[PDB]
Write a protein that binds this DNA or RNA. Sequence first.
RNA 1: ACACGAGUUGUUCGGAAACUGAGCACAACGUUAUAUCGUUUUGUUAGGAAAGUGAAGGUGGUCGGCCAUAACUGAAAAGGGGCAACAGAGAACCUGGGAUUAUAUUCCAAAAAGAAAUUGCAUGUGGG
RNA 2: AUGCAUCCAAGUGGUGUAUAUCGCAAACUGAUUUCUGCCCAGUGCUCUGUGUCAACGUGACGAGAUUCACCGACGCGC
RNA 3: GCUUCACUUAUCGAAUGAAGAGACCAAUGGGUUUAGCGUAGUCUUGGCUAUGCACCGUCUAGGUUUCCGUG
RNA 4: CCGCGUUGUUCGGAGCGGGGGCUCAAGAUUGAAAAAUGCAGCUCUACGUACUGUUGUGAGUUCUGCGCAUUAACGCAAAAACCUGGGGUGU
RNA 5: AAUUACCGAAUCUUUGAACGCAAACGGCGCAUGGGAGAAGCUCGUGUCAUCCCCGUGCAUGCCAUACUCAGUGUCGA
Lengths: 254, 118, 220, 62
Amino acid sequence: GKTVLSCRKGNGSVYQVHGHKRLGPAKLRILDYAERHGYMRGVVKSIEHEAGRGAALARVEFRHPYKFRRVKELMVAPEGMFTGQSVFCGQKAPLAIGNVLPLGQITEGCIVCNVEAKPGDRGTLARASGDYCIIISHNHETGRTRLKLPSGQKKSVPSTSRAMIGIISGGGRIEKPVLKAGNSFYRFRGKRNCWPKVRGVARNPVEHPHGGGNHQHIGHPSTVSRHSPPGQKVGLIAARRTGRIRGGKAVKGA
Amino acid sequence: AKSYTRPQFRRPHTYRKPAMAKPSNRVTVESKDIAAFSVIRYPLTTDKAMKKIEENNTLTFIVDSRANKTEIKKAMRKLYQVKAVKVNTLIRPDGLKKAYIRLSAAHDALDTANKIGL
Amino acid sequence: HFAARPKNFGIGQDVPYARDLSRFMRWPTFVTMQRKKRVLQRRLKVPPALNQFTKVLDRASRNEALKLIKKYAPETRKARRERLHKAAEEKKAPLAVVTGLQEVTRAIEKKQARMVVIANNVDPVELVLWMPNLCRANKIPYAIVKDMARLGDAIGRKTATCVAITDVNAEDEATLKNLIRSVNARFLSRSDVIRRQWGGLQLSLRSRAELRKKHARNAG
Amino acid sequence: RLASRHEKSVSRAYGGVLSHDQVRDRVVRAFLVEEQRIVKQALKEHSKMKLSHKRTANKKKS
RNA sequence: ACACGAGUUGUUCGGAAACUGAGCACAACGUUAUAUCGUUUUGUUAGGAAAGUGAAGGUGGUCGGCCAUAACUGAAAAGGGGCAACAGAGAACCUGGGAUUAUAUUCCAAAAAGAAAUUGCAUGUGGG
RNA sequence: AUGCAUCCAAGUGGUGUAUAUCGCAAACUGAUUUCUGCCCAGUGCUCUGUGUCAACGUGACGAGAUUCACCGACGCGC
RNA sequence: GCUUCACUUAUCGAAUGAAGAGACCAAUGGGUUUAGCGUAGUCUUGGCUAUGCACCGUCUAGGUUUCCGUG
RNA sequence: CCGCGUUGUUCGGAGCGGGGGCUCAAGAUUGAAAAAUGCAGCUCUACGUACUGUUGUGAGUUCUGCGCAUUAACGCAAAAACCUGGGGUGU
RNA sequence: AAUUACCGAAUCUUUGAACGCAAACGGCGCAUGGGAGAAGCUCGUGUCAUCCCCGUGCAUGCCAUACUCAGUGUCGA
Ligand SMILES: NC[C@@H]1O[C@H](O[C@H]2[C@@H](O)[C@H](O[C@@H]3[C@@H](O)[C@H](N)C[C@H](N)[C@H]3O[C@H]3O[C@H](CO)[C@@H](O)[C@H](O)[C@H]3N)O[C@@H]2CO)[C@H](N)[C@@H](O)[C@@H]1O
Ligand SMILES: [Mg+2]
Ligand SMILES: [Mg+2]
Ligand SMILES: [Mg+2]
């Protein structure tokens, strides 16, 4: 009879991101003329931590292409990125770790990160800590590059969309156990209000579809349709299969 | 025009005429000579006021509450032919502004306060 | 010591001169959409009733026409305030072209005009969209000239949609009839072509060059 | 703001901005990185002119 | 308590003038039968011509080819205003007093009991 | 990401998202240790696509309205 | 009716302080205000057209490289 | 190229330790202020006068040393205002 | 020159649609005009630097209007 908590987070009031101590958005520098034809060189000045990421950032210093100034550029770093490194950025840039060059120019079987799903949107794929994409092939009739995303789900992207070379920095993070509810307090401190997580069976029937009863049970089957309304779509949303996955590992996604 | 060197079109500066000064909007006389009788209202005659005339040098007046210390000094020159060196104003809990007005030690405080009469 | 210091304007080199960013700048909304309005009238396939205004009488017949419309322009306000104050003394219009969209229409329904001159760019185009087919149904020679600023300049206005010529003086009568033969070649005797010539469907210069290099590579 | 410039700077280049160990590390690389390109620029023009008489000397050999 | 008469003094103290923060929402734009609605800091408004400031020079009264003061031309500055902190930022004054019935880093007058710090503007002396 | 969940009367609207599968969203169980068996008929979900299912579209009788015939997707059937 | 291949101008999305897009390397390209010269067939209000084709003109230059190259 | 040093988890040919220095930060000291002030006494013929006096290797103190500075899957606001340089002018 | 009633002439603080910008601020502007002015300068008068008072113009949208513009909109030399 009352609104479900998952529906309430879309109002986004108490549940927005905790962004006051965050730095800017981490993206690649602007796809200008200087990268469509040549390379821009920068230099890494600082390796940075912001709250709510597990990957290290980097401010790289370019010269502005058209004015007498220098552009501070906050990128997310790969592993091995040291201060002073001279990142190169563009078409004629070489094939080294830290450089950003189009996917047409990166030979096959190469680990890339900060790959972008359309040219110019400044990096949208493989940016969580320790992730990377692998370049499978190129097609020169269509001008598209087909690469393996960190989930295994393949994706064909245009070969003019650029990518950085390396693993994303800060990898190995999930492999240590948290051990405390105190350490999960501060993990979600710089993220957003989503912790502690109360189970639906622990609720009353007014708050959640699973709530109520004299035993904490889900009554109905907990696999809901894709077409369920907001409020009814809780549980295992459109589950193709449930249970302990006994066997291989299917890639998850459409 | 020509020679567009910036990525966006900002507004060209045309010739812009000044505005005419209007003749009048107020039809009322305002005498500059009576204009300091509204600044200074009347003196206080209390015990703390009488002590400061004799011992320090100061005079005490209720003034209007929307005057500053500079225009109280200039009204204590045109009304009373004395020189104020220091005014210490005070908006009272009564609602009135009270000023302590110290004279310039070339002017006696009692000789002014007899001419006013208090 | 007047030596030369050349600046290197390669990529990543010395910061360059100020270019002309006129073709890549954010323009105002009225100039970026009066320029896309002109593309869109060119790219789309235009019916033969609006195609006919893109087909215009040439310069030698237009500069002959408006110079003849100039000398039979209507008299001005002073030239009409006089001849009436000099005729209220007689109890005490010499000759002109027909101008105006209500007056030129009557000169064709009555078949009094000997030549009609139509502008090509009136801003609601439906005002003179019907106008060549009225001259064609009544067999008055017409023209569509490159005008509406140049017609109003000829007659003393800012804008004229149409000018009709009912009659002239006999001095420039061969000039009037040489102009009618010059203008029926383009419009009235060529009427069966004008009725069925669908215009438009032009490409970009940029799209056209992607048919050269898309066919020169599949040339074998 | 009320102090002299000398309590806030020092008498050399980048004084009050950079220290002595890195004013000199910029003097040294403003010389060595400029002169390294001069070695590689003059090597480049010496290569293209040796090409200009490796094949133009084959006009008198066939 | 009641009646009557008094009592809060600042260049520096707190605030504002004059900061930004979480945020707010004026203009602009869109929506709505309806503005009393939405967007409006991830560098930042608005399909979006919101800079009224002015480098250098030309023109002609001033100071020893430099200044400075008055009026035309035009390099260069993308990203409109205003709020929100009396605990964050910022902030030039400290004692002594026999100076109160009650106020004081606030009042004290020629030996200011006195000792300063600071802002604006101006003469004179001296230096370029 | 031409996404998932979701706000929302409405828009070139809003949140997770200053993000980008070591991420975000929805559930269950409840530290370690030791294990987690059998059941896909029922009921849910979900996947590969010719019975049946509406409007539209098509054709015909008739003076026409009205009829009749055909085509008709998700979805259940399989 | 239906459709799979190429289009781009509506529409959508992203990026950008709308900062260098395409050509010049050339047509299954344009042009009576850029239609100059012809050539076949065909029509006409004698002013000239339409179809079909050839040429001309718009149409210029260039880092590097021994014609390629593609700013 | 075992050495220096801390109560303490460390440092050094990418320059330890000695010898001479240059600086910065926190104090100490001499002075101007400032004795004229302050306090407590007291002495004399009226809120009157004249004189007299002005250590500590103890304990507690967050001012400071102090940060690329804490546990951290916690990494610790911003801006105005100001300061110095680069480059230019003065040439 | 009573006082009362009536009304033509006026006065009408701070606000408020509230409109120069703000606001738990009797706060702060940009043009423009007037004032006062114990410092200076002047040959005590004048003049008067900051400071300080007072009037007026200035919200935004729109209509009409009389000058300066933008536009690879269409022309035109
Ligand atoms: N829904 C279908 C279409 O999706 C379009 O938008 C799509 C994308 O453009 C868009 O993705 C963009 C992302 O590409 C780009 N990096 C920036 C943008 N923040 C993203 O939007 C994202 O952010 C917000 C969360 O705050 C989400 O509401 C939104 O669903 C999410 N996609 O999310 C949508 C994916 O469905 C248009 N909004 C519109 O044509 C239409 O809604
Ligand atoms: Mg009482
Ligand atoms: Mg400590
Ligand atoms: Mg107001």
